[PDB]
């Protein structure tokens, strides 16, 4: 998980980083400067994680590419309402115990942390209204409220 400048004064231990909402991991930290867009960074991370899926189990294999496509749409301002809620649901449903191995919980850790800490950058990519359908001539659509 991503951490902010306020978490820099934390000892690099498993217990201390664990209660900050992240993991100690390999303890080889990566710094992100202000010139890096968080949506593009998480898109790069999720592209890596989705293409490195072993393909055994459904949530990682078929839900990481969905997050990749959502982040790609958010990158060029083609996001639609419900995309961030979809990303949050993907983070919740790809956590530990839901997938076969721990590849996908690690995949969704930076996505959920970046949404938690930098939600204004993910909201900035939502420009178009939601459209999943096209009109079919002769059939009046069911306009849900």
């Amino acid at each position: 998980d991503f951490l902010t400048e306020a978490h820099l004064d934390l000892p690099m231990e498993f217990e201390s980083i664990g209660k900050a909402g992240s993991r100690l991991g390999t303890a080889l930290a990566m710094a992100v400067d202000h010139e890096i867009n968080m949506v593009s960074l998480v898109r790069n991370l999720e592209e890596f994680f989705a293409r490195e899926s072993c393909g055994w189990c459904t949530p990682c294999r078929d839900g990481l590419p969905w997050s990749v496509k959502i982040l790609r749409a958010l990158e060029r301002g083609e996001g639609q309402p419900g995309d961030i809620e979809t990303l949050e649901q993907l983070c919740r449903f790809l956590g530990p115990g839901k997938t076969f191995c721990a590849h996908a919980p690690g995949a969704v850790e930076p996505l959920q942390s970046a949404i938690k800490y930098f939600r204004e950058e993910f909201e900035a990519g939502i420009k178009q209204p939601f459209s999943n359908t096209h009109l079919i001539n002769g059939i009046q659509p069911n306009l849900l409220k």
């Binding site: 001539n137 002769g138 009046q140």
Partner: protein
């Protein structure tokens, strides 16, 4: 091509006897008195055709006799229930010659949606039918169209002018099917109005 009721035969038709047969057929087809017999919802559409917005009287077929003896046409407008089938057969037998039958609606045609223990599957299982009308119910103008089809069928049939002289057999024309007649215009249809409008 004709069918004989006393077989598939040819046209039996002097030139004065042909004119008399045409006059009798014209008078019969322009004066068709239906029997007031109501089985089910199809009869509601039939009597709707009798009202002001359709005016089946214009064809001279509004008299609507309560006695089978005064009626020329039995419209089986409704389901042939098993309890009602002897009643229908008795009322048809009480009608006098010439008599014609229009089966109206899917129930009278075949039993319709009621393939069920208490329903005879079509009135043609026990009485002969001159004109069939699909629909559930057929709209009143469909009943009028079947009336006109019956008029065309009557206008070219051959019946004895008298019961004391001549051939007594009833010859009915083997008319071309309406499906085959209308197939040319029906298949050529390309576009219809979309169902999103009035």
């Amino acid at each position: 091509d004709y069918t004989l009721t006393r077989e598939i035969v040819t046209d039996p038709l002097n030139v004065f006897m042909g004119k008399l047969n045409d006059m009798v057929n014209w008078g019969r087809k322009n004066s068709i008195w239906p029997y007031n017999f109501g089985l089910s919802c199809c009869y509601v559409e039939m009597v709707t055709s009798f009202t002001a917005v359709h005016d089946v009287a214009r064809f001279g077929a509004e008299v609507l006799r309560a006695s089978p003896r005064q009626a020329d046409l039995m419209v089986v407008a409704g389901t042939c229930f098993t309890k009602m089938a002897p009643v229908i057969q008795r009322l048809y037998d009480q009608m006098l010659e010439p008599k014609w039958v229009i089966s109206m609606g899917a129930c009278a045609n075949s039993g319709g949606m009621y393939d069920i223990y208490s329903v005879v599957q079509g009135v043609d299982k026990f009485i002969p039918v001159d004109v069939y009308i699909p629909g559930c119910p057929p709209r009143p103008e469909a009943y009028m169209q079947a009336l006109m089809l019956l008029q065309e069928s009557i206008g070219k049939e051959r019946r004895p002018l008298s019961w004391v002289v001549g051939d007594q057999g009833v010859y009915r024309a083997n008319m071309q099917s309406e499906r085959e007649r209308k197939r040319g215009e029906r298949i050529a249809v390309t576009n219809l109005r979309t169902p999103d409008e009035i």
